[PDB]
RNA sequence: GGGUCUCGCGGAACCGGUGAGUACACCGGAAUCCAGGAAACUGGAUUUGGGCGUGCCCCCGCGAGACC
């Protein structure tokens, strides 16, 4: 069915330029309207833009007019914003979403998963991977609990995956913290039997994009 | 003059199988074109009613909407622990299209007490020359719960972050991270690390702990 | 009394929904007229070109001028 796909985010300086794309398939843009909406992080929901292809309209909330511009190529069924004079408050996530109005009215009713823009002067970094060994005297009741600490990296987001993607269950990826340092950290844990620990082989696999760093990390008892 | 979505409340608690009601007061008249929408944390909004009472296709049907006027009601009438989220009112009416502040539904559960568990720094994180421990707390219930690390029975301060995680779609419980960070060189002064838990499921507080240097 | 371009005048209202991708094909609420009731209405008969965050466009019809 329908699909949208935010891409261009990242890591800007002050005063910067970025520029988002949204990939849409299922449908064709020429006969809906796309829409960007922001989320600062921890607030609300921000409406920026919106544009309507087979009517050239371009509607822009009053916090971006000028600095932002949204457009759109029909052949290639994508949308653009635009982004000069970046500021911090600009910092949030991206999200694209479409509307029609002719033949329904039904809202934004399908949203992309989102890009995350982050104005900052500090420097993209890559994350150090540690494991975090299931403690050697005991655990809780049959099950055991082993994770990866992912340190000081810029900006977010990571991604931890279990095992190639074979392990969900039991699995808490904490939300990330902001040193005093100024960098991110986080743990990603799972609960296992403790029965598999010496039969099943717990890697954590982090990706974080911005800097081109994976590392896949053994976790194993100490 | 931009239309301004009045939500409340900012957040509430509620059992499973409650009647969950959110309103959103448009001011100055969007006649029907008002959406509510379902942010669960980290993903896309998801469109829930449109048109103020038209329930968007795939949604379950103990979600509604209502109008009277400018004020507008979202109700679940059964709330299941996956409704865990946080929802919006919007009004399309006309641009700008604005947007309710949020309201924070949070799933009110038995008390669960926390698995705790405590993790000493790796080897291959001592050589870069810091310490990282971690104490874990896993699955419990309310999030009200207090961690305090000691390092050869000496209370530490201002050397600790924790962060939690969002309410469980499934178990509504939540987890807890806390990490104590040193020196090597302070790591490497002391030999007992305990994590220290205490949460209302707790009748007494649980200590997690190592000494330094077990294979 | 024909064909092509330009200009002028036109092609019920509201609310939904379904296939299509162009500017089309549909299905419902409904409205209109008539009759009846104190009455929200009830019968019977009939009824609107389309696209798109919307003031512009597509198509169709009629008129006028120019060109054959």
């Known amino acids: 069915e329908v699909q949208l796909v935010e891409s261009g985010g990242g890591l800007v300086q002050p005063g910067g330029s970025l520029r988002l794309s949204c990939a849409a398939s299922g449908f064709y843009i020429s006969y809906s309207s796309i829409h960007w909406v922001r989320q600062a992080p921890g607030k609300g929901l921000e409406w920026v833009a919106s544009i309507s292809p087979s009517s050239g309209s371009t509607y822009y909330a009053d916090s971006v007019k000028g600095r932002f511009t949204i457009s759109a190529d029909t052949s290639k069924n994508t949308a653009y914003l635009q982004m000069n004079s970046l500021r911090a408050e600009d910092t949030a996530v991206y999200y694209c979403?479409?509307?029609?109005?002719?033949?329904?009215?039904?809202?934004?009713?399908?949203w992309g998963q989102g890009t995350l823009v982050t104005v900052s002067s500090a420097s993209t970094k890559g994350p150090s991977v540690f494991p975090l060994a299931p403690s050697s005297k005991s655990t809780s009741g049959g099950t055991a609990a082993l994770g990866c600490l992912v340190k000081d990296y810029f900006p977010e987001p990571v991604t931890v995956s279990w095992n190639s993607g074979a392990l969900t269950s039991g699995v808490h990826t904490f939300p990330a913290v902001l040193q005093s340092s100024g960098l991110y950290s986080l743990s990603s844990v799972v609960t296992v039997p403790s029965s598999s620990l010496g039969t099943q082989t717990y890697i954590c696999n982090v990706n974080h994009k911005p800097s081109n760093t994976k590392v896949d990390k053994k976790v194993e008892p100490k | 003059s931009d239309i301004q979505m009045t939500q409340s409340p900012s957040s509430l608690s509620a059992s499973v199988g409650d009647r969950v009601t959110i309103t959103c007061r448009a001011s100055q008249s969007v006649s029907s074109a008002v959406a509510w929408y379902q942010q669960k944390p980290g993903k896309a909004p998801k469109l829930l009613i449109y048109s103020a009472s038209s329930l968007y296709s795939g949604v379950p049907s103990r979600f509604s909407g209502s109008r009277s006027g400018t004020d507008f009601t979202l109700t679940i009438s059964s709330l299941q622990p996956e409704d865990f989220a946080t929802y919006y009112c919007?009004?399309?009416?006309?641009?700008?299209?604005?947007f309710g502040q949020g309201t924070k539904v949070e799933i009110k559960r038995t008390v669960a007490a926390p698995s705790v568990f405590i993790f000493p720094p790796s080897d291959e994180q001592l050589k870069s020359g810091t310490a990282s421990v971690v104490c874990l707390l896993n699955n419990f219930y309310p999030r009200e719960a207090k961690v305090q690390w000691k390092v050869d029975n000496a209370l530490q301060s201002g050397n600790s972050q924790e962060s939690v995680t969002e309410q469980d779609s499934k178990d509504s419980t939540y987890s807890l991270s806390s990490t104590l960070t040193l020196s090597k060189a302070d790591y490497e002064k002391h030999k007992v690390y305990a994590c220290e838990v205490t949460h209302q499921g707790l009748s007494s507080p649980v200590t997690k702990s190592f000494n330094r240097g077990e294979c």
């Open positions: 979403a479409r509307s029609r109005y002719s033949r329904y009215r039904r809202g934004f009713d399908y």
């Open positions: 919007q009004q399309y009416s006309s641009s700008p299209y604005t």
